[PDB]
Amino acid sequence: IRAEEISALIKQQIENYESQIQVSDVGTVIQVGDGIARAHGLDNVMSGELVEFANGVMGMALNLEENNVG
Amino acid sequence: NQEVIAKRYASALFQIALEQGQLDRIEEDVRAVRQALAENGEFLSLLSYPKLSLDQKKALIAEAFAGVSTPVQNTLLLLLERHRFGLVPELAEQFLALVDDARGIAKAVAYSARPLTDEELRALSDVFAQKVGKQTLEIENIIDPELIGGVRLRIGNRIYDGSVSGQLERIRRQL
Amino acid sequence: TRGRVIQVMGPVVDVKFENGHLPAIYNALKIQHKARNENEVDIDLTLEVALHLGDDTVRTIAMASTDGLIRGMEVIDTGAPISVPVGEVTLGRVFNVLGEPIDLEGDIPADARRDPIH
Numbered sequence: 001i002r003a004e005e006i007s008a009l010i011k012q013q014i015e016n017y018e019s020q021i022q023v024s025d026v027g028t029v030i031q032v033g034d035g036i037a038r039a040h041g042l043d044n045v046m047s048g049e050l051v052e053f054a055n056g057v058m059g060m061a062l063n064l065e066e067n068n069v070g
Numbered sequence: 071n072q073e074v075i076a077k078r079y080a081s082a083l084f085q086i087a088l089e090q091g092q093l094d095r096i097e098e099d100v101r102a103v104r105q106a107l108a109e110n111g112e113f114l115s116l117l118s119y120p121k122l123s124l125d126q127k128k129a130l131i132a133e134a135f136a137g138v139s140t141p142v143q144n145t146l147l148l149l150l151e152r153h154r155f156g157l158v159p160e161l162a163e164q165f166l167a168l169v170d171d172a173r174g175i176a177k178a179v180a181y182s183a184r185p186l187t188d189e190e191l192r193a194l195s196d197v198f199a200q201k202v203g204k205q206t207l208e209i210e211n212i213i214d215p216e217l218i219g220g221v222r223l224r225i226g227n228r229i230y231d232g233s234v235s236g237q238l239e240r241i242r243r244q245l
Numbered sequence: 246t247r248g249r250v251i252q253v254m255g256p257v258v259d260v261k262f263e264n265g266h267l268p269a270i271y272n273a274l275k276i277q278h279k280a281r282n283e284n285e286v287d288i289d290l291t292l293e294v295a296l297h298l299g300d301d302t303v304r305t306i307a308m309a310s311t312d313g314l315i316r317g318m319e320v321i322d323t324g325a326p327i328s329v330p331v332g333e334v335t336l337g338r339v340f341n342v343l344g345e346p347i348d349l350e351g352d353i354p355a356d357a358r359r360d361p362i363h
Contacts, residue, residue: 002098002099002102002137002138003101003102003103003105003106003109005137006102006103006106006134006135006136006137006138007105007106007109007110009133009134009136010106010107010110010113010134011110013113013116013130013133014110014112014113017116018112020121021116021119029297030120030299031296031297031298031299032270032296033270033295033296033297034296040118040119040120067118123264124264124300153300
């Protein structure tokens, strides 16, 4: 009985934050170091693609691993 | 490598539920958490999102996972602080395995060409309860009509077959 | 905008700042800690940010020895890399890594020009 209202609460939270996720062509950085950035996001990025940071520095997406982009 | 860590966390929560004497409520709301996270899989991807801070995710759990008991909510927040929120359904399955080990309830899956009557299910439970050593036992029944005239019952990782492979056994023996 | 020490692993100290207030790479971080009791040691370090780890965690390099560090000491963000005094002031003087006089001829006043290393 309580599983239905817990499901309703988590579905309401997903419906609230689904506008704020917007992860298709944008990504947020997890790790920065030594000229390498692993970024959460960028679901549609290609392998060997020009990608651009917030301050205007370009980058090349080589590793398209599962939960981040190297 | 996730099931051993889920067994670790579930054994801790199981010892808490036994020392508080509230095993049934912890079992009930762990079943509720498992059903709620199996209903929607976007919640783990929401709580893996980096722009949400840790306190906001804790507020999401405290507002969303409400009505569950206090050790369950503390376990979920402890998993959130340790970046181990991906193994909450594994925690729920290992914890319900420990609860069914405590109560003596065994899980069995029977494959029969006809849907079995309830007296036959009670008879199978009374037969295999002495076989596996447990007090009582549960049967889940799926038809699977490729089977012809028999039952194929599986308790854990042991299969008790008497449905079709008698004919496969004899044609393997003739050839 | 303070951060606390997570790990002390030889010359390498991991520091966790608050969310959104991480220091940039190569910035100097300072630990001025006064010993609260007889079970602690007065420590005075300059940490240099080398990497950014996952959850608001910064991996730093210590310019001096890390012995006596406690997991939880407050770390001060300078907002800039290791600023070294330059000019006619530096002629005839022996300096540290951090731009401080080793010899006993004095110290360089705070109004002097200091340029970044990087």
